[PDB]
Ligand binder design. Structure first.
Ligand SMILES: Cc1cc2nc3c(=O)[nH]c(=O)nc-3n(C[C@H](O)[C@H](O)[C@H](O)COP(=O)(O)O)c2cc1C
Ligand SMILES: Cc1cc2nc3c(=O)[nH]c(=O)nc-3n(C[C@H](O)[C@H](O)[C@H](O)COP(=O)(O)O)c2cc1C
Ligand SMILES: [Cl-]
Ligand SMILES: [Cl-]
Ligand SMILES: [Mg+2]
Ligand SMILES: [Mg+2]
Lengths: 399, 399
C-alpha cells in the first residue's frame, strides 16, 4: 500500500533534477541509492544472490543516470561475520557482481561498491565457527550485552587489533577496490560510518588505544585516512568516496553526547580537503544525517536536534551526499538542494519504490516499506515491490 | 554626520531586546560592546586615561543593563608593547580601572575586562627599549615585513617561548584576573583571537613547535585551555569568557585557507562544553564572524563566504556573542537573534554612537565613525560623538 499520511510534492522543479558529475559519472539527477544491506547473499562463500540480485539492482537502476551505491560488501572473510551479506574477495563473488554491474550499466545508471569491515558488529559465533577473530579497535568495552553473550558462548574474545593486522586489513581494502573496478564498478565507497570498524577507531568510546591509532583526533582518524590514501593510490581519487555518520549512535557509537565529536569529523573533512588541493579530491563525501541516528528506528525517531552536519560544508568543498529521512520530507529536500553540490540519498523508500526517482519528480504517492523483509532470505520484499503503474493496476490507490 | 546609504530598522521587536543572564549579570538587552582598543592610555605605565576614560565608558554604559567588554588590557609588561594601551598589573592602573568600573555600575551596566598578550603583534623596538623579549609560539616565521624590519633595527629577535615562560604568562593571567575582579569588574574575557599570543599558538601557520604546545590540535590548544582552567579556578567559571576568531586573518593568522581550521576551533569548543558538563561552564563564548576577517577593513570588505561559525552551536551549548558588521545589517541580526542564546557585539558603531542601543531599538540613523580617531591620543573621536538628540541639535540630519 501507499504511505497514508503523506502529502507528496513534485521535486522536478528543483536541483534534485539537475545533472551533476560525480567521479567519472554524469548523473542525470541527484537522488542517490545509499548502501542498503539486504542479507540475500548465499552461504557458504558470501555470494551475491544468484537468483534475485541482478533483478533487484536492475529495477532500481531503471531511471537513467541514477547513482547506485551497493549494499556493504566484505573485503575479506575476517572482515565479515554475517553469513548472508556479500563479499568482494573471491572469483565466485565477482562473477555475480559483474552481472549486477552490467545490468545497472545497461539501464544507463552507475554503481559504486561500498566496502565494509564489521569489527565489533560481527557475530562472534560465526567467526569462531570459521576460525576467525572477533576484532575491534580495543578490548575493554563491548558493543552490547547480546554481543557479549555471543562472544562468551563462542569463547571468542573481542580482540584489540595489533598494528600489522590493521596493515593486513588495508591490504584487503586495496585488493577489494581493485576487484570491484576490474569487475566493472564505477567506483567504491569507503564505509567509515554506522559503528563498523573504521568508525570504531574514529570514536573515543570504542577506541581507547594508546598507540598511534588512538588517544587523539589525528590518531583516531589514522586508520580511515590510511584506507583513503591506499585506495586513491590504487584506483584513483575520482573512483573513491567516503561515508561518515558524525551523529550516529548505531552500534554503540558516541554521537553528539561526545563533545569532541564534531572536531573528530571536522578533522577528517579537513584532511580530505587538504588532499583535494593536493590534487587528489575524492568523488564525494557521504554523510548520514542526525535526522537518523539509528536506521532501525522508524522515521522521526532517534532524531538528534542538537547538532548539524552543515559544518562539513565549511571545510570540504566537493560534492556532498546526505541521507536520512528525506523521502517523507520533500519540503526539507527542496531547501537542501538549493546548495548546488548537494545530493540526497534515499534508503528505506528506495527499498520499497523501484521507480522512486519518477515518484519524486512527479510528486506521486510512495509505497510503504516492509521492515520485516529488510533482511529476509526472500524475493518477497526485495524484488516484488511495484512501480507506480503496477501499484495502480493492483488497486493500491484503493487500500 | 549620519551614515548616508543606510536604511535603519527598529529591532525592539526582536530578542535583541529580551533580557538574558550572562555570568552574574542580568543584561536587559543583547547588544554587547566588544573589546575596542583605543590607544588613549598614558605612557609611562600603560595607565588608563586619567582625563577621558571614565567619560568614554560612562557614555557607552548609558543604556541600563548593557554588557561592556573593555579594550584589551595587558596582563604584564612582557605581555605588552603598545605604549598607549592599558595594563591591569599595577596599583596605578587599577586605581583608574576602579573609577571606570564604578562609573559603568552607576549606570546600571556591566563590565568585563579583556585580558591580552600580544606575542608577535607587539612592537619589538618598544620591548627592546624596556628590556623585554619579543615573544611568539615559534621563531621561524615572522608576522610581516614591517615587524621584521622593526625587529632587525631593534636587534630584538622573535623568540619562541620556552615552557617555563608560558607558565609565567599563566601566572600573570591569574593575577591580572584577580586584580580585575578585586577592582570591581564583573568578569574577564580571555582573548584568544585576532592573532595575539594565544591565537599564535592555536594557528598552524604561527605555531610550528614540536613540543607539547604544538604539532597537533590538542597541543596547539593547550596554552589557551590552560589559561581557561587557571582562571576558572582563580575567580570562577561564571566570571570567565573566551574570545575566538576562527576565520580571522588579521595579524597573519590562517583563516579558512587552513583546511584544519574548523577542527582546531571545534576542539576548543568541545573542551569548553566538556568542562560545562563537568560543572564549570564559561559565562560565554565570543566569536568574531567571517563577516569581518580583518577589523581594519571597511564593512563589506574582507568577508569570507566560504565558512560559517555556526558549527560552534552544535558543540557549545552556552551563550554565544557574535561580532562583525552587524550594525549596518539589522536584517541579519533579526535572523540571528531568533536563536535564544545569541548576543550581538557591535564594535565600530559603538565607537561612534554612545546611545547605540536606543538607536537599534528605535531604528534611528547611525553616526558615521571616524577611523582616523580610532587610535588617536585625543578626546576628539573618543568622547565627543553625539547622542541622537545631540546630533539633531547639531543639525546632522541636514548634512
Ligand atoms: C535495511 C537497511 C540496510 C542498510 N545497510 C547499510 C549499509 O550496508 N551500509 C551503510 O553505510 N548504511 C546502510 N544503511 C543506512 C542507510 O544507507 C541510510 O543511511 C539510512 O537508512 C537512512 O536513510 P533513509 O531514512 O532514507 O532510510 C542501511 C539502512 C537500512 C534501513
Ligand atoms: C578600533 C578597533 C579596536 C579593536 N580592539 C579590539 C581588542 O582590543 N580586542 C579584541 O578582541 N578585538 C578588538 N577589535 C575587534 C572588534 O572587537 C570587533 O570584533 C570588530 O571591530 C568587528 O565588529 P564591528 O564590525 O561591529 O566593528 C577592535 C576593532 C576595532 C575597529
Ligand atoms: Cl548470520
Ligand atoms: Cl606604541
Ligand atoms: Mg509480512
Ligand atoms: Mg579628521
Amino acid at each position: 500500500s501507499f504511505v497514508k499520511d503523506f502529502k507528496p510534492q513534485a521535486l522536478g522543479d528543483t536541483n534534485l533534477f539537475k545533472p551533476i558529475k560525480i567521479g567519472n559519472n554524469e548523473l542525470l539527477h541527484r537522488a542517490v541509492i545509499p548502501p542498503l544491506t539486504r542479507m540475500r547473499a548465499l552461504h557458504p562463500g558470501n555470494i551475491p544472490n544468484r537468483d534475485w540480485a541482478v533483478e533487484y539492482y536492475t529495477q532500481r537502476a531503471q531511471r537513467p543516470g541514477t547513482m547506485i551505491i551497493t549494499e556493504g560488501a566484505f573485503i575479506s572473510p575476517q572482515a565479515g561475520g554475517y553469513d548472508n551479506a556479500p563479499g568482494v574477495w573471491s572469483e565466485e563473488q565477482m562473477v555475480e557482481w559483474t552481472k549486477i554491474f552490467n545490468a545497472i550499466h545497461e539501464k544507463k545508471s552507475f554503481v559504486w561498491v561500498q566496502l565494509i569491515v564489521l569489527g565489533w558488529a560481527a557475530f562472534p559465533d560465526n567467526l569462531a565457527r570459521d576460525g576467525l577473530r572477533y576484532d575491534s579497535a580495543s578490548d575493554n568495552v563491548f558493543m552490547d550485552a547480546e554481543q557479549e553473550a555471543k562472544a562468551k558462548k563462542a569463547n571468542n574474545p573481542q580482540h584489540s587489533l595489533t598494528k600489522d593486522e590493521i596493515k593486513q586489513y588495508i591490504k584487503e581494502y586495496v585488493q577489494a577496490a581493485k576487484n570491484s573496478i576490474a569487475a566493472g564498478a564505477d567506483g567504491v565507497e569507503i564505509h567509515s560510518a554506522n559503528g563498523y570498524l573504521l568508525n570504531q577507531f574514529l570514536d573515543p568510546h570504542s577506541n581507547t588505544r594508546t598507540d598511534e591509532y588512538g588517544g587523539s583526533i589525528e590518531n583516531r582518524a589514522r586508520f580511515t585516512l590510511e584506507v583513503v590514501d591506499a585506495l586513491v593510490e590504487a584506483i584513483g581519487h575520482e573512483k573513491v568516496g567516503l561515508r561518515l555518520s558524525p551523529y550516529g549512535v548505531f552500534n554503540s557509537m558516541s554521537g553528539g553526547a561526545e563533545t569532541g565529536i564534531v572536531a573528530q569529523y571536522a578533522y577528517v573533512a579537513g584532511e580530505l580537503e587538504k588532499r583535494a588541493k593536493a590534487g587528489k579530491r575524492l568523488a564525494f563525501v557521504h554523510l548520514v544525517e542526525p535526522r537518523v541516528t539509528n536506521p532501525f528506528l522508524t522515521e522521526g525517531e532517534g532524531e538528534y536536534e542538537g547538532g548539524s552536519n552543515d559544518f562539513v560544508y565549511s571545510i570540504w568543498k566537493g560534492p556532498v551526499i546526505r541521507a536520512g529521512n528525506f523521502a517523507l520530507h520533500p519540503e526539507v529536500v527542496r531547501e537542501e538542494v538549493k546548495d548546488k553540490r548537494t545530493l540526497i540519498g534515499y534508503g528505506r523508500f528506495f527499498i520499497s519504490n523501484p521507480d522512486l526517482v519518477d515518484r519524486l519528480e512527479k510528486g506521486l504517492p510512495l509505497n510503504k516499506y516492509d521492515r520485516d523483509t529488510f533482511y529476509q532470505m526472500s524475493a518477497h520484499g526485495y524484488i516484488d515491490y511495484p512501480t507506480y503503474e503496477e501499484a495502480l493496476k493492483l488497486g493500491w490507490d484503493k487500500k
